Amino acid sequence: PSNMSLVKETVDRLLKGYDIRLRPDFGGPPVAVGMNIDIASIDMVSEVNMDYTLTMYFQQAWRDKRLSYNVIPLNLTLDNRVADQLWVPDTYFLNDKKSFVHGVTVKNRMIRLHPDGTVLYGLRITTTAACMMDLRRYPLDEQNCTLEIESYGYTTDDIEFYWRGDDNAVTGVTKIELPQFSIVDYKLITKKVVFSTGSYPRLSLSFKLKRNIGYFILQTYMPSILITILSWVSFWINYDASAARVALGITTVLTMTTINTHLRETLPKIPYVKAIDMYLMGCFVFVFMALLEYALVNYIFFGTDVNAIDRWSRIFFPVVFSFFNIVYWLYYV
Amino acid sequence: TILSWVSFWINYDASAARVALGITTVLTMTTINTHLRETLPKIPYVKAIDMYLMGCFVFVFMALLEYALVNYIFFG
Amino acid sequence: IQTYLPCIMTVILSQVSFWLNRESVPARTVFGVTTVLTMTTLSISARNSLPKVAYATAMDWFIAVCYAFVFSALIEFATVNYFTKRGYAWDG
Ligand SMILES: *[C@@H]1O[C@H](CO)[C@@H](O[C@@H]2O[C@H](CO)[C@@H](O[C@@H]3O[C@H](CO[C@H]4O[C@H](CO)[C@@H](O)[C@H](O)[C@@H]4O)[C@@H](O)[C@H](O[C@H]4O[C@H](CO)[C@@H](O)[C@H](O)[C@@H]4O)[C@@H]3O)[C@H](O)[C@H]2NC(C)=O)[C@H](O)[C@H]1NC(C)=O
Ligand SMILES: *[C@@H]1O[C@H](CO)[C@@H](O[C@@H]2O[C@H](CO)[C@@H](O[C@@H]3O[C@H](CO[C@H]4O[C@H](CO)[C@@H](O)[C@H](O)[C@@H]4O)[C@@H](O)[C@H](O[C@H]4O[C@H](CO)[C@@H](O)[C@H](O)[C@@H]4O)[C@@H]3O)[C@H](O)[C@H]2NC(C)=O)[C@H](O)[C@H]1NC(C)=O
Ligand SMILES: *[C@@H]1O[C@H](CO)[C@@H](O[C@@H]2O[C@H](CO)[C@@H](O[C@@H]3O[C@H](CO[C@H]4O[C@H](CO)[C@@H](O)[C@H](O)[C@@H]4O)[C@@H](O)[C@H](O[C@H]4O[C@H](CO)[C@@H](O)[C@H](O)[C@@H]4O)[C@@H]3O)[C@H](O)[C@H]2NC(C)=O)[C@H](O)[C@H]1NC(C)=O
Ligand SMILES: CCCCCCCC/C=C/CCCCCCCC(=O)O[C@@H](COC(=O)CCCCCCCCCCCCCCC)COP(=O)([O-])OCC[N+](C)(C)C
Ligand SMILES: CC(=O)[C@H]1CC[C@H]2[C@@H]3CC[C@H]4C[C@H](O)CC[C@]4(C)[C@H]3CC[C@]12C
Ligand SMILES: CC(=O)[C@H]1CC[C@H]2[C@@H]3CC[C@H]4C[C@H](O)CC[C@]4(C)[C@H]3CC[C@]12C
Ligand SMILES: CCCCCCCCCCCC
Ligand SMILES: CCCCCCCCCCCC
Ligand SMILES: CCCCCCCCCCCC
Ligand SMILES: CCCCCCCCCCCC
Ligand SMILES: CCCCCCCCCCCC
Ligand SMILES: CCCCCCCCCCCC
Ligand SMILES: CCCCCCCCCCCC
Ligand SMILES: CCCCCCCCCCCC
Ligand SMILES: CCCCCCCCCCCC
Ligand SMILES: CCCCCCCC
Ligand SMILES: CCCCCCCC
Ligand SMILES: CCCCCCCC
């Protein structure tokens, strides 16, 4: 128990007369605050809220002469509550919408004082960071979502940020398994953002997510392709069968527009036209033209050659649809 | 289920009519069942409402197969 | 009773069209189109329960096979109608 008393005396000395209101090297050079992330998971990448939920082990390391000790050789890992008695950088995520440090069992914090004065301060943070997504090529789109770590109150004359370990500062991104996304790349940037109050350091952790297209084949593309192929069946029914061909046509057209509306209602009310919208409207053109082809057939007959029109449609509709698919997929993939 | 039975008073030589009526009735039975079950949790057993909906589905499907049987006895 | 039974019932519905006379073009056509549309909406609804996983689940394969069955039932009716040499059906 003697070493316990020695460590108690050392920590009591460290916290005695400690001005939490004053940063390290106050009235001096900016304190270098290194950072390193451990991405626990990326979840809830939702375009309706234009955000993504990021769970991470956010570590910051900074020198502090006031927290330097030399009697004890080992590194003191203190109870997390001591973080309330220590100066910590006032970092924030500029695009954060709703964040929290995890609660159970205790506050998910780590404080580790090293003999040289280095403070390793870690948090387990779940942050719903805002990511404004460009859905013009959705679902065949790459989204560049960022986390903007910045010092709120301290300018570059009072604090500096750097990725501790350079490109090795952020880890665990590869092990992330998003349901409908693939994280093809991630990048770390150090900037100096200027506001009217001064110039502040900035760390930008940017993930370039790539959306997986397999699910959208199952739910979005294949049903509409099948409905178009079904609408092509009306060309194989003789022109006299008005009820059958008209029912086939209107059922296909209405189901197409219903599919488009149902899919677009889930997504946000973005004004521009997406890639899925482009494909759905293109196939709506095909099915509506099938219905209008029967309309032309009926008018031309009632109001040999009509069999010619029906036969030419019977082969040109799949060919033109296949060329539409060629152009669309070549442009977007 | 009541309007499924009006197919029986329709003329036998009205396939486009009776078939459409029975199809609409059975598909609506399926839609009602799914809409009711969506509100409830993913409960893995049949409830009383479930068993009544299933019985009425069996009845409307039987009416549709009654027209099928009449058509196959007359034509086929 | 939410996906598998509806899919089996719509497949058996599409297989009712085979017992209707070939001349009833509107009836078998509405049979096929309604079964196909029901299969489409069932496929769309089934995916809504689980996440947007890229791969296909066993439910997806069962739905795909049922979709192939109903689509082929309509294609079969179209083939029958192609060789339907007369419009008027049996009488007397
Ligand atoms: C209390 O805490 C301190 C600080 O962490 C510990 O001291 C450090 O222990 C680490 C062990 O991980 C040492 O790191 C190793 O240093 C080797 C020499 O590097 C020199 O040069 C670098 C240049 O930046 C200096 O930062 C460093 O201090 C040294 O002067 C490297 O060769 C090692 O590289 C690799 O090592 C293994 C594989 O061998 C890998 O697993 C590593 O990830 C790494 O890739 C490694 O970096 C470090 O030298 C120690 N001193 C420091 C940081 O000043 C104490 O041990 C700890 N005391 C306890 C726990 O009782
Ligand atoms: C936003 O985020 C900030 C983070 O900085 C939060 O601010 C901290 O909030 C916590 C919780 O409210 C504060 O913790 C409080 O510390 C007080 C001082 O503790 C010292 O002194 C006492 C004796 O006076 C010692 O016992 C202790 O060990 C320290 O040496 C305590 O007096 C407070 O006690 C209250 O809570 C306890 C919980 O067990 C009760 O039992 C008590 O009866 C009493 O109600 C409390 O522990 C902390 O000081 C705040 N600042 C910092 C820098 O951490 C904000 O709360 C959060 N939200 C908002 C809206 O700002
Ligand atoms: C997600 O999207 C964000 C957009 O916000 C991207 O972040 C930007 O990335 C770009 C490119 O990485 C940054 O732009 C510049 O990067 C340079 C990298 O070095 C190259 O260029 C220099 C100069 O041409 C070459 O000498 C060198 O060999 C490399 O080829 C930096 O060097 C740049 O900094 C310099 O220019 C600026 C502006 O002139 C000066 O202020 C600096 O002092 C310095 O002289 C510059 O940073 C850009 O900074 C990033 N942030 C933005 C735009 O806010 C992400 O990369 C992207 N991520 C993914 C995964 O897609
Ligand atoms: C360039 C490459 C582009 C690539 C795309 C390829 C596009 C090309 C595809 C074009 C469509 C193929 C039909 C072309 C011929 C139609 C005309 C015709 O009627 O011909 C004949 C019948 O027609 C047949 O022989 C039927 C063969 C096609 C049936 C395929 C069904 C399979 C469904 C699978 C779907 C499952 C969906 C799976 C999900 C994905 C006979 O015609 P006729 O009546 O006797 O008149 C001629 C006689 N006269 C000359 C005297 C007048
Ligand atoms: C002669 C002929 O082929 C007929 C066959 C089908 C007809 C179209 C149907 C839809 C109509 C909507 C509005 O009434 C405007 C005219 C409109 C586009 C029509 C133009 C003439 C068509 C093509
Ligand atoms: C002869 C006769 O009465 C006809 C009238 C209607 C027909 C049924 C329709 C549905 C079918 C689904 C599958 O094709 C398996 C067989 C299946 C149950 C058929 C059995 C024979 C029936 C009853
Ligand atoms: C601004 C983009 C408008 C796109 C309109 C739909 C295009 C469909 C083409 C169908 C070709 C047959
Ligand atoms: C964005 C301005 C309106 C663009 C309209 C394009 C319409 C093309 C439709 C072609 C279908 C035959
Ligand atoms: C709006 C009318 C659509 C008609 C489409 C006909 C396609 C084939 C044309 C062949 C002409 C001989
Ligand atoms: C798509 C435009 C078709 C124009 C056809 C003109 C028909 C004129 C009436 C005489 C034959 C029906
Ligand atoms: C019969 C051909 C129909 C269109 C085929 C789709 C082509 C997909 C290209 C994907 C990009 C590599
Ligand atoms: C990368 C995804 C490629 C999907 C291509 C689908 C092509 C369907 C063509 C249907 C033509 C009838
Ligand atoms: C497992 C419980 C069975 C659910 C379906 C009940 C159908 C019975 C009623 C049929 C009346 C003809
Ligand atoms: C909902 C997605 C269904 C995909 C299955 C495709 C079925 C192809 C039909 C083949 C008929 C011969
Ligand atoms: C291409 C869309 C499906 C068409 C199915 C009809 C096939 C008819 C075959 C009988 C003619 C030989
Ligand atoms: C488990 C009982 C099913 C009853 C089915 C009635 C005839 C289709
Ligand atoms: C109920 C189906 C079997 C009997 C049909 C009528 C006689 C072939
Ligand atoms: C567990 C019983 C399932 C019944 C499936 C319906 C067969 C026509």
Q: What does the DSSP assignment read for A83-119?
A: GGGS----EEETTEEEEEE--SSS--EEEEE-TTSEE
Cβ-based neighbours of A185, under 8 Å, separated by 6 or more: A207, A208
Among B10, C57, A207, which Cα is nearest to B66's? B10
Quote the ligand 14 centre to A216 CA distance (angstroms).
15
- Is A151 annotated in some ligand binding site? yes
Atom of ligand 1 nearest to the CA of A118: 4
Q: Is the CB of A281 under 6 A from ligand 7?
A: yes
Quote the ligand 2 centre to A80 CA distance (angstroms).
12
d(CA C37, CA A250): 12
Report cis status (omega within 30 of 0) of the bond before A115. no
Structure tokens of A12? 């009591």
3-state secondary structure of A129: strand
> The tokens 């060329």 sit on which residue?
A323
Q: Could you count the other beta carbons within 10 Å of the beta carbon of residue B15?
A: 25
d(CA B66, CA A233): 28
- Is A171 annotated in some ligand binding site? no
- Contact by Cβ (8 Å): A207, A76: no
Query: Which residues are A42's β-sheet partners?
Result: A54
Resolution of the solved structure (Å): 2.7
Torsion of Cα atoms, B68 then B74 then B75 then B76, to 10°: 70
Quote the ligand 16 centre to C45 CA distance (angstroms).
25
CA neighbours closer than 13 Å in the CB half-sphere of residue C23 = 13
Cβ contact (<8 Å) for A179 and C52?
Answer: yes
| Exposure string over A311-323, b if 16+ CB within 10 A, otherwise e | eebeeebeeebee
d(CA B53, CA C2): 12
d(CA A146, CA A94): 10
- Contact by Cβ (8 Å): A278, A328: yes
- Chains touching chain A, criterion 3+ CB pairs below 8 Å: C
- Contact by Cβ (8 Å): A143, A131: yes
CB-based pocket (< 6 A), ligand 1: A 74-75, 114
Closest CB to C43: pick one of A223, A248, A252.
A223
> The tokens 């069942």 sit on which residue?
B33
- Contact by Cβ (8 Å): C73, C29: no
- Contact by Cβ (8 Å): A249, A281: no
Give A271→chain C minimum CA distance, Å: 24
H/E run at residue B52: helix B48-74
Cβ-based neighbours of A240, under 8 Å, separated by 6 or more: C87
Query: Would you list which residues of chain C are within 8 Å, Cβ to Cβ, of chain B?
Result: 1-2, 6, 9, 13, 16, 19-21, 23-24, 26-27, 30-31, 34, 38, 45, 49, 89-90
CB-based pocket (< 6 A), ligand 11: A 322, 325-326, 329, 333
Closest CB to C19: pick one of B27, B54, B72.
B72
Cβ contact (<8 Å) for B75 and C89?
Answer: yes
Q: Is the CB of A142 under 6 A from ligand 3?
A: no
Which residues from chain C sit within 8 angstroms of residue B11, using beta carbons?
A: none
Task: Identify the DSSP state of C89.
Answer: -
Strands (E), chain A: 31-46, 51-63, 76-78, 91-93, 96-101, 109-113, 118-130, 142-151, 159-163, 170-171, 181-195, 198-211
- Chain B nearest-CA residue for C31: B23
